[PDB]
Enzyme design. Structure first.
Site, PDB file in Angstrom:
ATOM      1  N   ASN A  44       6.467   9.489   2.750  1.00  0.00           N
ATOM      2  CA  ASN A  44       6.195   8.867   1.457  1.00  0.00           C
ATOM      3  C   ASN A  44       4.917   9.470   0.847  1.00  0.00           C
ATOM      4  O   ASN A  44       3.886   9.595   1.505  1.00  0.00           O
ATOM      5  CB  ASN A  44       6.036   7.363   1.709  1.00  0.00           C
ATOM      6  N   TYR A  73      10.742   9.381  -7.426  1.00  0.00           N
ATOM      7  CA  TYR A  73      10.583   8.783  -8.750  1.00  0.00           C
ATOM      8  C   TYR A  73       9.622   9.625  -9.582  1.00  0.00           C
ATOM      9  O   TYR A  73       8.780  10.350  -9.043  1.00  0.00           O
ATOM     10  CB  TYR A  73       9.958   7.379  -8.709  1.00  0.00           C
ATOM     11  N   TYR A  77       2.523   5.296 -13.666  1.00  0.00           N
ATOM     12  CA  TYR A  77       2.190   4.510 -12.494  1.00  0.00           C
ATOM     13  C   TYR A  77       0.709   4.168 -12.455  1.00  0.00           C
ATOM     14  O   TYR A  77      -0.137   4.997 -12.791  1.00  0.00           O
ATOM     15  CB  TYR A  77       2.591   5.367 -11.291  1.00  0.00           C
ATOM     16  N   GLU A  86       0.476  -3.220  -8.648  1.00  0.00           N
ATOM     17  CA  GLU A  86       0.855  -1.809  -8.625  1.00  0.00           C
ATOM     18  C   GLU A  86       2.055  -1.797  -9.580  1.00  0.00           C
ATOM     19  O   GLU A  86       3.037  -2.504  -9.346  1.00  0.00           O
ATOM     20  CB  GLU A  86       1.279  -1.377  -7.219  1.00  0.00           C
ATOM     21  N   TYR A  88       4.949   0.288 -12.325  1.00  0.00           N
ATOM     22  CA  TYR A  88       5.759   1.497 -12.571  1.00  0.00           C
ATOM     23  C   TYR A  88       6.574   1.350 -13.876  1.00  0.00           C
ATOM     24  O   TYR A  88       7.250   0.360 -14.114  1.00  0.00           O
ATOM     25  CB  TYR A  88       6.846   1.599 -11.485  1.00  0.00           C
ATOM     26  N   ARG A 122       4.773  -6.708  -2.172  1.00  0.00           N
ATOM     27  CA  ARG A 122       4.408  -5.893  -1.023  1.00  0.00           C
ATOM     28  C   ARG A 122       3.544  -6.800  -0.159  1.00  0.00           C
ATOM     29  O   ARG A 122       2.571  -7.385  -0.640  1.00  0.00           O
ATOM     30  CB  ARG A 122       3.612  -4.670  -1.477  1.00  0.00           C
ATOM     31  N   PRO A 126      -0.743  -0.996   2.292  1.00  0.00           N
ATOM     32  CA  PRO A 126      -1.902  -0.247   1.798  1.00  0.00           C
ATOM     33  C   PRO A 126      -2.026  -0.441   0.286  1.00  0.00           C
ATOM     34  O   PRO A 126      -1.025  -0.633  -0.401  1.00  0.00           O
ATOM     35  CB  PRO A 126      -1.559   1.196   2.158  1.00  0.00           C
ATOM     36  N   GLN A 136       4.389  -5.982  -7.483  1.00  0.00           N
ATOM     37  CA  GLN A 136       4.655  -4.720  -8.153  1.00  0.00           C
ATOM     38  C   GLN A 136       5.490  -5.082  -9.373  1.00  0.00           C
ATOM     39  O   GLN A 136       6.368  -5.947  -9.299  1.00  0.00           O
ATOM     40  CB  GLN A 136       5.496  -3.777  -7.295  1.00  0.00           C
ATOM     41  N   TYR A 171      -6.627   2.919 -12.090  1.00  0.00           N
ATOM     42  CA  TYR A 171      -6.087   4.185 -12.609  1.00  0.00           C
ATOM     43  C   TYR A 171      -4.696   4.054 -13.242  1.00  0.00           C
ATOM     44  O   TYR A 171      -3.965   3.105 -12.999  1.00  0.00           O
ATOM     45  CB  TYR A 171      -6.162   5.324 -11.559  1.00  0.00           C
ATOM     46  N   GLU A 177       6.660  10.550  -7.056  1.00  0.00           N
ATOM     47  CA  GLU A 177       6.668   9.886  -5.763  1.00  0.00           C
ATOM     48  C   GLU A 177       7.891  10.373  -5.001  1.00  0.00           C
ATOM     49  O   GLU A 177       8.931  10.656  -5.599  1.00  0.00           O
ATOM     50  CB  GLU A 177       6.729   8.357  -5.924  1.00  0.00           C
TER      51      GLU A 177
END
Length: 190
Positions: A44, A73, A77, A86, A88, A122, A126, A136, A171, A177
């Site tokens: 990943n 993907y 992001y 997170e 998308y 999630r 991490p 997400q 960011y 990805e």
């Protein structure tokens, strides 16, 4: 230049390149907002260029070649903090739709296509602040493309209407990805 995972600034743009430790990925920063990622049997990884911090009304342009051979993907992001999210806006993907199994919340039309909206969670994963549980947010474009403009406000507003709020932006990039696949991509952000 070809680099290992890390974040920083290159030719006026923020970049972030992260991977799970598996090899096979070649991430290279280029002039301006350009980056390329060529991967052969990766794990990943997520890499691309943009801004630190992002904004809630940025109109992001991207263009390039996107040749995934499996799970991958191409998304606008990014992250927010408080709440930790997170997110998308997926413009293109390979063999796997990231919303598979997720509960659809709505649809929004933006920049030439309908997008389906979803929220996932999630757990103990991490993140930009270390191991954490967080949500997400997803907008998945129905009409896949490798170039165009994304009015992020249309998506953030659509998400907000479904109760999906964003905190203070961290960011915001256009990222390629990959997940245990192969592929090649070269993208220019602006």
């Amino acid at each position: 230049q070809t680099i290992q995972p890390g974040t920083g600034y290159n030719n006026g743009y923020f970049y972030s390149y992260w991977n799970d430790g598996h090899g096979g990925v070649t991430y290279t920063n280029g002039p301006g907002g350009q980056f390329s990622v060529n991967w052969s049997n990766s794990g990943n990884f997520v890499g691309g260029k943009g801004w630190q911090p992002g904004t809630k009304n940025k109109v992001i342009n991207f263009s390039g070649s996107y040749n995934p051979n499996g799970n991958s993907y191409l998304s606008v992001y990014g992250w927010s903090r408080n709440p930790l999210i997170e997110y998308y806006i997926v413009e293109n993907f390979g063999t796997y739709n990231p919303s598979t199994g997720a509960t659809k919340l709505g649809e929004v039309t933006s920049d030439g296509s309908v997008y389906d909206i979803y929220r996932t969670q999630r757990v103990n994963q991490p993140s930009i602040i270390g191991t954490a549980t967080f949500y997400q947010y997803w907008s998945v474009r129905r009409n896949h493309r490798s170039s165009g403009s994304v009015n992020t406000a249309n998506h953030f507003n659509a998400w907000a209407q479904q109760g999906l709020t964003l905190g203070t932006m961290d960011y915001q990039i256009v990222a390629v990805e990959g997940y245990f696949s192969s592929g090649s991509a070269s993208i220019t952000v602006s």
